[model samples]
Structures are given as structure tokens and as C-alpha cells.
Target chain A: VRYFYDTEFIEDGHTIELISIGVVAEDGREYYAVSTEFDPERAGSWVRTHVLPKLPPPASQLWRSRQQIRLDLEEFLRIDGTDSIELWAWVGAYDHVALCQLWGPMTALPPTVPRFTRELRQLWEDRGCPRMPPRPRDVHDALVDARDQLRRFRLITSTD
Target chain B: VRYFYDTEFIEDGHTIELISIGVVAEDGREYYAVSTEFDPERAGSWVRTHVLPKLPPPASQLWRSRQQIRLDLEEFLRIDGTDSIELWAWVGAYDHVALCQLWGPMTALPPTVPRFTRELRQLWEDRGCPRMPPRPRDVHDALVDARDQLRRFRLITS
Candidate 1:
């Protein structure tokens, strides 16, 4: 299995208000978990900064809650199944960190790890260990960096 | 673009120490970022519970610092080029969060989005809605989970 995850928001000064979450499954299929504006609590500083300005008033109604987020995750995992799968993230460390912060303690289950990150790293090292280091991109935006990581992963992993 | 990321370790109890990072770039390239035993900082409670029982002292010396991680990312991006690239992460929220925590703030120019976890939600909606919800998994082992997300992304995006 393969997947992609991301978040979007509007930056309000020091705070980032959360806007939405993107989940793409294997085969390039996509799923969006969104929240409504009425969910004021979900609309944090990050959301305000990264998502608020860009969204239309009607679109703001999509904000969701942490509970809803939990549900979304459950559904994704349920349908996706737990067999051999590949996961990708622009900077995986942060995404894994967030999951640990939110669910690490409460849940008894072990955290899931993506295979792609390791494979990509090894491929990079094999190719003469290029000098340029991995740059950390903006925190909340999703698709932009997802696309970037995808491109890089392909290059390093390809046999050619 | 498509890709996969994972981590492998010998799990003993509840703790899972990181053994290595596995990455598969969008171009179907594969690589492994190995760790040495001397590098213990990366091995916290997780390693003690999940990975320690399996390794000898000398073998673990390969571990490296979290700081050097950026080198891998930087090199990948430089070669791939930033435009039209899509990033994927299974349960991305955690990965992206950890990245920011380790790297500090993203002070660089152009501000490329990390593209997993929350931001992907926006793009998913814009591209036409699909029935997908978030759920938790039993084991957080890197490779298994990475593959799960990869499959899901392939199904939905296709």
C-alpha cells in the first residue's frame, strides 16, 4: 500500500490555524478529511495563518475536531488494510512526531513506520552521496511538498 | 509523483528502537539510511523496548544524529527539483511534527509545503471528494505503516 498525508492552513502572526488534512491512498487515490468553521476550537493560530485568508467563507465551514480526526484515521486504516505497503512524507520525522504526540501514549498499539523513507535514503547514499542536504519546507502546506518528496524519491530509488 | 518511507527495528517489548530509515523516491529508487550503535540519542525508550534486545554493541554504532537527517532531505530535493513534486506520508501528522521538532522552524525562502498530514486535506477536497477517514494502526513499525499509506494513496489518487 502507498499513501500521502498533508495539512493546510493560514498563518495568523505567530499562530497557525489548521484548515484541513489530505490523505491519498495507493493507486494515487485521494481522500480529504476536513473540518467546519463552527468548530472554533479546531481553528487554532496555525489555521488562521495558513488557511483562513486563502479560503472562501463557505469553505471555512469544513473544519473538523480531534475526535473526528481519530475517526478519519480509523476509517483510512480499515479500508487500506495492514499488509505490505509503502508510505511517503516530505519530512517524515515531523509527521511521525505529531502522531506520537497525539496518540502515542493513549494507544497500546505500536506506531506505524513508512518503508519509503529508508529506501530513498539508501539510494541517495549509493549515488555518490550528493552534497546538498534536505531542506525543510513550510510547516503546514501539504500538496506542494508532497509533490517535491515524490519527485526526489523517484530519482534516488530508480535503477537507472 | 509517488514514494514510500519506513523504519526497521527489532522490537522486544513495547519500546521500538529505530534501526534504520528506508526511503523509496518517486522514481522507484530505493535506499537505506543506516544507524550505528554509538548513536544512542535516536534510541530512546522506544528502542529500549522494541529494538535493543536484538543488537550487539558494535553493530549499533552506526546510528547518527537527527541533525544530519537534513542532509538526506536536502540532497533528495536538489536532485529532484522542487516544482510539481508531491510528498506522501502514511499518518503524516506524526512524521511532519517530528520533522519540525527536530529541524526547528522552516526559515528558508519560497516556503515549500511539507505536503502530508493536515495540508493534504485541502488538496483532497479540491480535487473532488472521496470517502476516506482517519484510523489508528496496531503497530507503528516504520516499514509496514509506510506500505499501508502507499497503497491507500495509490488507490485514491488513481
Candidate 2:
């Protein structure tokens, strides 16, 4: 199973803390979670304005402790078995770091999780920089971006 | 002109300091320089072992202050107007940061230098993951790596 995912994070050229993540599998199954642990006050104005406003309310089920979110992601991703799964993301250097940090240190990441997140941007560039689908209105929401990436990936891969 | 380039930098997920840089223009001109400004003591053991030793001697012409390097790069890359030049690098997130830091804050970068460094890795990946050129023996030296990236890019694109 191939899963396309996206994450929203706060970084100051130092640490990158995950704000939220969304994963969309090729089969149309989806997962989304926001971490209550990320500090919005430390974030710059852009993140505060763009990302935090889009997150679910604190009381919503979509909000989870970072640890719980990691557990849930592990459970959700392992459904197809570890060996059969692949992870994809757009411009993923930071997203991969954010995703790996979910389980704590990079060394602590479980073997069941793919160590690499193949980049969709690279795939798109490789496919000759095709026209992409329009960006979603709910752009910064991790799930919406992930879903849009799937749409773009399908469009790029579909032979005309 | 398309110029494929690479940079060696020291990073601990916090600060990233440039160690050296190499640029290879498609027309066959090449530029390489080592920064005397970066603190090797702060670098990880792997970088210390692989990258530090490969740097030119402190007295060598290739060794220059980061500011001087930035100026030299500006002169080298602007032979054809800035608009006619393109920059490419492999897995360039940190390399671009390293390159941009040459001029100080990102906002301070001159208009003659590109704001973006295209990723050859992306082009290679986009080309169906073909067989890559053999890694050069001087693997971590930024110029050797940059040269090899150009080889791989040509192989992937051609």
C-alpha cells in the first residue's frame, strides 16, 4: 500500500515541532491528527495565522497527545503489513523528520515504519513538470494537502 | 547556463554552517572554495572525519572567508546575466541554506544570485530512478560530489 502524507510544523532553523499530519492511502482510506504538544506561542506569525487557525478545537477527537498520535499512526499504517507499505510526501525533508520524531528519536522509530518518505515533488519533476491541480482553499490543513497531493500524483502518473 | 553545485555544511538540527562549496557550469567552467569561518569543533564526528580533512590547506588560494567566497561566487556565476543562469544541487535543502547564508540573512542575498537551487535528485527521481554514476573516491569533497552530480544529471536527462 502506498500512503501519501503531509505535516504542518513550526521551525526556527533549530527544532521542528509537528503541529498536525494527514495521510491518504491509495485505496482512499484517510487519517488525520493534530498534536496538542506543539507550542503555538513560539511559532512565528505566519504559522500562527495560517496553521493554528485551521486545527480542530482542543475538545475535538482529532486532537491527540503526541504519543497517542504516534501509536495511532503506527496502528493505522501497519494495516497492510510493514513490508508491503510505502510512504510518500511532498518536499518531505522536514515532514520525514517530523514524522520520525513522532516515535521519539530517529533510532527509536519502529522497524514497521518505513525509514524513508519518497518525495512526490521529485516524482512530479521527474514526470516532466506537468500542470498540477489547483490548490485547495483549505491549504494548510495537513489532510487537505495530502489529499491534493494524491490528486496531483494521479494526474501526473495518468498517461494521456 | 545551468550550473550544478554542492555544499558541505555542519548541522545539528539547529545551526547549519557552511564548510565548502563547488559549482560546475554546463559550459565546463568550475569553482570551488572552502570557508575558514565554520567551526569544525562543533561538527559531528562523521563530518570531522570525512569533510574537514579534504579541505584545502589554510594558506591555499581555495581557502577564503565566507564573505569573500560569496563575492567570488557572484563574479563566477554572473558571467552570463543572472537571468540566464540556473542553479542545481542534489538533496538541496541544507545546501541551499548553506549557499544562501553566504550573503548573510536570506533577505540580504543579491539579485545576481538565485533565490532557489533546483534539485538534481528530483530530476533523477522523476526520470524513473535510473542507474546512477559511480560515486567518486573523493565523495565528501563538495567539488567532486558536484562534478559527479553533473555526471548523473547528464546520464539521467540525456
Candidate 3:
């Protein structure tokens, strides 16, 4: 089972706090959630410029606590108890770190979850890292990025 | 049986003038020559900025006549007898045009002397256009650029 994901986070060199996560299954299923735990100050200038401006307003009800999102992620994983999450991301070290931080630390992650972005990167190289599909007309967002990753994933896996 | 080559020339909207040509073979054969036909006044600002200062002084005898260089290039392509010249270049459009200009026009190129730059370009695309090798310390010169292109080709093709 293939899965691609992207995380929106803020890191101050001290901690990486999750702002949102979007995961897409190869079969077209998706999970997108937002966390109410990030600070604008911790986000570096690039993200602040590209990510902060278009974020859902802070007061929106869609923003849930980290604990709630974690439980929601557990539900996403439990849909088929026998299946595991095989996440892929481009340059996903920080995204993986942010995702692992949710379960406490890497050691705390359950046996069913394990991913390193390195394999995906090598696969990108092996397949020639074709041009990314046309981007959304507006600003970047986690789910949109995840969906884009899925599109690339499909292209790499496609026989054509 | 591979050869990598590059050219340094000046071009404006009107025309292109060859300043130098460099070719390097996989087995260590090399041909580097400067052209005397070019007009420095028409060479434009970029050649002066990136290519001029490092050139051999104008009085240096290394600047060969285009006819001599053309004959030398023919000898280069004929060395292996049966092996066709498999020329490689990085972003070779202008370089190809400049080289073809030597034999009169592109149509004048002999049958066996076909270029492989586009195939190499497609290979670069197939391999994700991996990063080029680090630059040598000094200004741009045709031979050094060909050697660097060969280095990159070795890495990509190895």
C-alpha cells in the first residue's frame, strides 16, 4: 500500500510544531487535519511568506488540538487494522520529524509506522524526477501539496 | 569511442563568430584551437566579461586560421577509422551552429559526422539533470569547458 503525505509545521531549531498534515492513499483515500499548536514566530521567513498568509483563520473551528489530531491519525491508520502507513515525501526529513513528534518521539512510534524520505528521493532520481504537475492557481496548502505528491507518485508508478 | 566538445563564440541577433573550439575524446585525445576570423569589436559584452581576459594574448600564434582548424577537426573525426564521432555537448545549440558554420553550413556536414547533443540532452533529462561538477579555479576557456563536460559525462554515464 502506497501513501504520500505532507506536513505544514513551524520549527525554531528547538521544536517542530505541527500546523497541519495531509496524507493520501494510492487508492484515492485522503486524510487532512489541522492542529492548533504552531506559532507564527517560529516559522522561518520562507514559510511565513508562502504559508502563513493563506492559512485558515486561526479562530476557525477546523483547528483542533494536537491530541485530537493524533487520535484522528490513529483512526486513519486503523481503517484496516492489518495495513500499515507507508509515507512518502520529497525532502521529507522535517515532515517525518513533525509527524513523529506527534507520537512523542521516534521510539514511541508503533511498529506499523516507519518511513524515511531518502528512498523516495532516490526513486525520484531513478525515474528522472519529471516535472511536477501544474500547481494550484493560488498559495500552497498541505493537502494540495499532498495531492500533488500523490500525482507524482502515480506518474512514477504508472507504466506510461 | 566518445568525444565531448564545447565552443566559445560571440553572437548577437545578427550573427555568431567562433572564438575557439575544444574537443576531448574518452581515450585522452584532445584538440583545442582559437580562431582568427572573429572580430573582437563584434564579440559583444558577455564574451569580454566571461571569455576574453583568460584568452592567450592576441599576438600569440595559438590562434589558427579557420581552414586549418577545419582540417584538424576532420582529422579528429577520422582517427578511429570506423567509429563515427559521437559528439556531446551541454546546451549545444549555439555550439552546434558554430561548428556547422565551419563546413559552410549545417547541410554541408558529412554523413558520418552527425551530432549527438540532443540525445545527450535527453539523457540529461532522463537522469534528472544531476548536478554538474564543481568548477575549476580560473576563467572560462573552451578546452577546460570541454574537459568539464567530459567529467560530467563520465559521472552521468559511468
Candidate 4:
């Protein structure tokens, strides 16, 4: 099964530090988590301006330690046997890089999960590059962004 | 203004040789030419199989000298007024590279024509990467391939 996902991250110049990840399966199952690591005050100015305002309260249950988030994500995505699960995003090159960091380095990523978005930007253009409406209360929250990403594929596919 | 183009070439690890260039404008204007440079026998097996058969007979007027093709393409693209002209293609990375090789190496390319295609594979996938009907004739002629490239954009944008 393919999941359309998105991530919001803070890059401290040299490296991209994790902020959040959102994944939505075709069947509407979802996984969302915010990294308890990294102090928001220390993240870049752009992220602070554009993304921090949208975050849920830091005390919310959604705030998780790095290990918990990664472990839970693996559980949500893994199956007893390898059927296949792919992650896709629009203009997702950066997100793929961010996600890989969870496993240490790019080389450390599991062979089973193929990193990188399946390329929706081109498809979005070919489909006339429709302008989409903003989600009802916006902040660069990864979960909402992932849901909005799902909304796009859903609009094109119209399975609902 | 937007131009859709394609290039036919040979790549053997170290270099990619320009063989042909094809362009079509939004207004139906077109330019197609085979480079007088490069031998067909030297191109990789894939191009030989998929691209060679599409060639016009060796003596065809379409076979202009490489310099002539480059000049004509520049003329075709020049405008009395610059609004903006962009290049686009299907799987355009290497084709864009081949198109650029005309001016010497990568760095020598004219500051004008920007490199890179507005990639289609992703958009192709979103529209469910619909299986396309095959172009009837055999051979991967650059001009025909370009028009076929145009055809997909037309199909989706329609």
C-alpha cells in the first residue's frame, strides 16, 4: 500500500533536525508525531516564523521522544511479511532526507522501506497544476500538511 | 512563451554526443534536424535499437551540419521582445544535457536558456500514470518524440 506523507523540520544550517512527521495511508490510517528533541527557540528563524506558530501545545501527548516516534512509526508501517509500503510526497526530496536521519545516515535506512517521494509535483502540473485551498486552521504542522497532501491525491482519484 | 524539445544522442560513459534536436512551440512552430556530427554505429545499444530506426534516410535535408542545427534553433527561439521562454520535456535530464553540449561544456552554455525540464513522471503518476497509447511508427525520432511529449501535456491540460 502507498502512503502520502509530509514532514516539517528545522535545519540548523549544516543538518536538518527533525520537527514532525505525518503519514496517511490510502485507507485513511494516519500516524503523526512531533519530536521531543530540539528546543524551538534554537530552530531557524524561517521555521520559527512559518511553522512554530502552528504547533500544538508542547505538553500535548503528541510530543514524543525520538526513539518512541521512530519505533511507533515502524510499527504502524511494518507488516508481519513484506507486502510493500511506499511513501510519497510532492516536492519530497527534502522530506526523504529528513526521514532517513531517523535511521542514522542514508546508508543506515532499512532496505525494505524505499526512501524518497514518488514525485507528485510533476503529476500535479500535468493534472493542470490545480490550485488547492488551505486547510482550515493552518500552521506548517506536518500532520495537516500530510492530510492536505492526501486531499490532493484524493481529489484527483475521487475514491470517496 | 514555452518550448517543448527533445534530443537524440550517444553516451558512452565519458561523453554524450548530440545527434539530433527537435522543438515545437505553443503556436505549432517546429524545428527538427539531425547533426552532421557523430556516427550512428557508435551510439549505445538502446539508442541503436530504439532511436536509429527512426532516422530519416541519410541524404534527407533534415541532416544538417551540427553548427547549422544549433544556429537555426537559436534563430527559432530568438524573440524581438523577451517575455520569457522556458524549455520543457519528458524525462529531460540527459536530453537537456545533450541540448546544452552544443555550446561546449556545461559551464559554457548561454546564460539565456535555463536547463531542466518541468519533470513529467510525477504528474504522470498523479494522473494515475495512465498507460499511453503507442506512437504508431517505429523509431524514436527526436521531432516525433517531442510532439509525443507535447501530446501528453495536451492530453492532461485538456
lDDT (CA) per prediction: 0.47, 0.80, 0.70, 0.71
TM-score of chain B of each: 0.52, 0.93, 0.89, 0.86
**Predicted structure 3, TM vs. truth:** 0.48
What is the C-alpha DockQ of each candidate? 0.09, 0.18, 0.01, 0.06
Which order, best to worst by lDDT? 2, 4, 3, 1
Better of 1 and 2 by lDDT: 2
User: What TM-score number comes out for model 4?
Assistant: 0.52
DockQ, candidate 1, vs. native dimer: 0.09
**What is the per-residue lDDT of model 2 for residues B66-145, given as tens digits with 9 covering 90 to 100?**
87997898888884463576778887756766676676654466765665566676567556799986777999999998
Residue B109 of model 3 has an lDDT of 63
Note the chain A TM-score of all models in turn: 0.54, 0.94, 0.86, 0.87
Off by over 4 Å in 3: A1-160, B119-121
The weakest ten consecutive residues by lDDT in model 2 chain B span B105-114
Candidate 3 at B104: error in angstroms?
0.7
What are the per-residue Cα lDDT tens digits for candidate 3 across A1-160? 6678888776543345687888877788888778876776767777888887767786876688888877877777663477755667754645666666677733456677753332344355557777666767552688888888777777776864
Candidate 1 residue lDDT tens string, B48-126: 5754544335545334554455466556544346464445554344344333333344433124534332333333433
Query: TM-scores across all candidates?
Result: 0.38, 0.77, 0.48, 0.52
Error of 1 at A72 (Å): 1.7
TM-score: which is higher, 1 or 3?
A: 3
Error of 2 at B143 (Å): 1.1
Could you arrange the candidates by TM-score from highest to lowest? 2, 4, 3, 1
